[PDB]
Amino acid sequence: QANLMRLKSDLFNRSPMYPGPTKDDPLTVTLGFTLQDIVKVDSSTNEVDLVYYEQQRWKLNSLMWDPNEYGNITDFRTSAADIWTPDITAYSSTRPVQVLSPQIAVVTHDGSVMFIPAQRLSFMCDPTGVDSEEGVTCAVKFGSWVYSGFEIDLKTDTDQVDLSSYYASSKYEILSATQTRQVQHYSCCPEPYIDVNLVVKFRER
Amino acid sequence: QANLMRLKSDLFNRSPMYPGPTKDDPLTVTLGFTLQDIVKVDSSTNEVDLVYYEQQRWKLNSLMWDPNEYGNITDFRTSAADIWTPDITAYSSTRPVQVLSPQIAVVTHDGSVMFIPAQRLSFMCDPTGVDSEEGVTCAVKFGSWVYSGFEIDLKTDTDQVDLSSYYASSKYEILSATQTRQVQHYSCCPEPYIDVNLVVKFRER
Amino acid sequence: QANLMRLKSDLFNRSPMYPGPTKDDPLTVTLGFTLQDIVKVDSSTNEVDLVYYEQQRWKLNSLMWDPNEYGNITDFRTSAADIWTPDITAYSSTRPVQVLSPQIAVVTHDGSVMFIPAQRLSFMCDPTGVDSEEGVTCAVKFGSWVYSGFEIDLKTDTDQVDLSSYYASSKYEILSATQTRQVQHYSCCPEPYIDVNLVVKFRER
Amino acid sequence: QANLMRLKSDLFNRSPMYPGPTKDDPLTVTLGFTLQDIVKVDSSTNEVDLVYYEQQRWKLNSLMWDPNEYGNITDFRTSAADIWTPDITAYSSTRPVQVLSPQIAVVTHDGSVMFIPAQRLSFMCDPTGVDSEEGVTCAVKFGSWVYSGFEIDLKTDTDQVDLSSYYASSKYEILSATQTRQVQHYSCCPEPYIDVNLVVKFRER
Amino acid sequence: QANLMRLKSDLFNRSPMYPGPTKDDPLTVTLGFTLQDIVKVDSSTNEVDLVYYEQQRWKLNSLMWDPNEYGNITDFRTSAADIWTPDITAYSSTRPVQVLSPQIAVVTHDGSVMFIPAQRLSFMCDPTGVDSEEGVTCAVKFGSWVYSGFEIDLKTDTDQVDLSSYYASSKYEILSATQTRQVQHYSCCPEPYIDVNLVVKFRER
Ligand SMILES: C[N@+]1(C[C@H](O)c2ccccc2)[C@@H]2CC[C@H]1C[C@@H](OC(=O)c1ccccc1)C2
Ligand SMILES: C[N@+]1(C[C@H](O)c2ccccc2)[C@@H]2CC[C@H]1C[C@@H](OC(=O)c1ccccc1)C2
Ligand SMILES: C[N@+]1(C[C@H](O)c2ccccc2)[C@@H]2CC[C@H]1C[C@@H](OC(=O)c1ccccc1)C2
Ligand SMILES: C[N@+]1(C[C@H](O)c2ccccc2)[C@@H]2CC[C@H]1C[C@@H](OC(=O)c1ccccc1)C2
Ligand SMILES: C[N@+]1(C[C@H](O)c2ccccc2)[C@@H]2CC[C@H]1C[C@@H](OC(=O)c1ccccc1)C2
Ligand SMILES: [Cl-]
Ligand SMILES: [Cl-]
Ligand SMILES: [Cl-]
Ligand SMILES: [Cl-]
Ligand SMILES: [Cl-]
Ligand SMILES: [Cl-]
Fold this sequence. Notes:
The structure is a homopentamer. Chain A has one helix at about 1-10, and strands at about 25-40, 45-65, 75-80, 90, 100, 105-110, 110-115, 120-125, 135-145, 150-155, 170-185, 195-205. By secondary structure, chain A is mainly beta. Chain A is built from 1 helix and 12 strands; from the N terminus they run αββββββββββββ. Chains in contact: A-B, A-D, B-C, C-E, D-E. The interface of B and C includes residues 1, 4, 8, 100 and 169 of B. The structure holds ligand V38 (5 copies) and chloride ion (CL) (6 copies). One copy of the ligand C[N@+]1(C[C@H](O)c2ccccc2)[C@@H]2CC[C@H]1C[C@@H](OC(=O)c1ccccc1)C2 sits at the interface of chains B and A. It is classed as receptor. Keywords: receptor. The assembly is pentameric.
């Protein structure tokens, strides 16, 4: 359709790209995790591998449009390259995250963007006692690597991690999986930094 | 040489790229698998490695042309970068898919496109009992990561996976291989998401 | 160096790139293998690792020039990116080929191009009996992934693989190595596809 | 905000990029290490893997501005690609460094730049005696690969490595971690080269 | 700085890039190796891993300048991408070379260029007898992949490999390390190909 072709150029090729949030014009990114599998556990390096998808959501006034002015188009899909995306990083990874999904995001007329990156992550986790009935607990923090609390804010729609798509025949059972917002102060910086703490209690099936 | 150079310019450099399907202008992608080998089976992580090529076909009105107006050219080969391609993704992969073939597609005057990506896939599968006479059964779903059934529809020309090119001296005998269209409903969204379920039954040779 | 700078500009920057062969403009690519080493044999996955270089050769009328019109220059070296190159692919690889040589080709005034890519290949090969006196035999087909026989034809200057540069202290002895042209018919396509079959009989040193 | 979009334009797109330091216009880069984990130790190759983040800091006159002239903007985040960055390299690495953080730096109105790359490093370290109560000591030098002392100078805000974020359940305890500036002389060059020596004494739990 | 920025524009953005050497305008590249460590020895595949840096040196008339006309600037550092670099390749590698240093070269007013790439190399080497007092000897040839002797010539400033920076606590002692120039003849070509043979005799510590 000719209508959608016009909207994409009337937004991206017509205006310069979003320079990211500022202290004056902050941004709130809504985070959410859907855990798929605990693939590997390396007891000799205390490295644990997770397969999950991360639901990222934010709103930009620069991405708004009137659907009536563009042939009643409410939303559209686009390459994550064509738009600004938050630098949400795992604070205890041991190897670069592996992307398992297409780099496509969906933009809506109200300016809200949704990005659902699937990934394989290796993080610092001591699995001592995973073989027990009680199980072992491990956590990993996610947040911006460069933006403070005054620039990028985080939130979760639920504190419960989505386990509805967890791999039934995994070598590891999930006992609990939690996503909790945290406000931390680091020596580096006078301003606070926000993260979402992914905490999973698991055991050998 | 000169006629083909002109056609490619008029199709890609003159008109804007296809913005993908919409609910109003959907698309049907025909899927098909040609299984080559079951390379590896990791019983400690329940990860199984597949080598296959998936034939994907779709038709675009934006890609039509009159062969008489372009020196009786009926079709041509082009980089998969020069054209829109469907985001068909494996829903239970454990590592990024490895591409084993050139990223070239073949376009025909009727607007039909054919892309046959060869790849190595590691997916979640419990291989317990592969050592038996009966063998073990495993499945993996393929479908769009961002487009719903209202935007991208999937179909198969047959429900029989092409095993004509399966590696005769593989460590694993293929007992059966099936490709079935399935329509799923996810908690995530209020529209159905459709996929192609690849179901293999195999055993040790 | 001024003469060569003019020639390279007048060929590539003056004319649009070669859109690849067609049935009206066919092409014959001469193939040849120089086997260097059989590095690894994985009996649990039936994957064998080769190190070789393949000599690719073709001729383009679009790449012809008068040496007298360009300061008696008969030939020149150029990046494989600056020119069209055939999509010669291994039909039974298990992992993406690893390039071990620079991506440079040599162009001659008659329009003939020579490209000698060195590479490490992992392909489907059952090594059962490599430990015997008789040894084990394995094969791998090479050919275009998208072009038929009426677009790209293949030929060999000899059926005998160059073993003159094979690694003397390899863990595996080559008993024989053959390169044979094959014309194959696939259901997919009304035209015959053509390839070069690399067959190597080898054993433990 | 357009105020920032105009500043990024007037800095980078208006002026040519910084050609790096010279003997006439030198630069001092402030270095600092935050050690996160000692992931593994390979006693058969004497290779040790570290996870840490490097804090890089320098000031450019070409990057300073009056905040009042650009809507009271004191600082901003930007891709490490659109700015010059020092070539600080590990002098005893055994494999290419793996980047674990986004390639974003923060520029301030005074022309001071801060870059905090997180990374996984494999370096030459003999772990003989890591099993003892005394532990083992290892070091790695960091510095410019091309710029000398007269071009790039290095300094540390402290000689103590930040261990505040070290992984509590690591297989290895840190006994001490030091960052010391060194001025060395190499045969290659008549001018002194300067580096920061990362020295860590550790032991297995 | 205003002065260096102008020279970098007048050198690269003014004139077209160097099309490489020809038979009429040859080039002599001076090679030199600084061996850092023998990391690994794989007796089951006869693959040995080296960590070293390779000093490359050549002179181009196209890169000459009058320092007085450019604010008494004698030399400058630049990306290896901005300039032509020789295709010096290891003739017996088993995996792609891993770069361990920044891709920056230093250009001098006389047109002489220096490039010092650090790298990790896996090459064909039978380590049988490394455990003995006598040790084992291994070699690897380095040279152009496309240019003959009549186009690129190689030379060494010394036949002795720099062992001054060899890793003190390496699992392997160097008994001798030699960098000798060789002129050979291959079947492929009527012109002689020239190379530098890196020969290292080593044993277990
Ligand atoms: C969350 N951070 C990492 C944090 O220190 C950390 C590191 C490892 C484990 C747990 C937390 C904090 C802040 C961002 C990110 C990287 C570090 O970043 C910084 O040091 C910083 C960031 C911006 C400007 C100046 C300095 C520290
Ligand atoms: C099928 N999906 C993956 C799902 O997690 C899954 C995993 C394993 C087996 C079967 C389905 C479901 C739906 C499409 C695809 C990607 C995910 O996509 C989404 O959740 C989504 C996509 C677009 C807009 C808003 C949300 C979840
Ligand atoms: C030679 N081909 C691959 C070969 O048959 C093969 C078979 C099994 C596994 C791996 C390679 C054949 C033909 C080209 C190439 C890729 C495949 O291509 C096709 O099926 C095809 C090609 C062009 C248009 C429409 C369909 C099969
Ligand atoms: C520290 N360097 C390496 C050094 O030789 C070394 C190597 C291994 C271990 C420890 C130090 C020194 C100086 C920078 C870096 C690379 C080498 O660089 C050079 O030899 C050089 C640099 C610029 C112009 C001409 C030559 C030597
Ligand atoms: C040294 N070469 C490889 C050589 O055959 C070899 C291969 C393995 C081990 C030792 C030497 C020789 C020459 C360069 C390089 C690549 C090969 O290159 C060629 O065959 C060639 C080069 C230019 C024009 C036409 C053909 C052969
Ligand atoms: Cl693994
Ligand atoms: Cl590992
Ligand atoms: Cl493997
Ligand atoms: Cl290996
Ligand atoms: Cl390793
Ligand atoms: Cl040998």
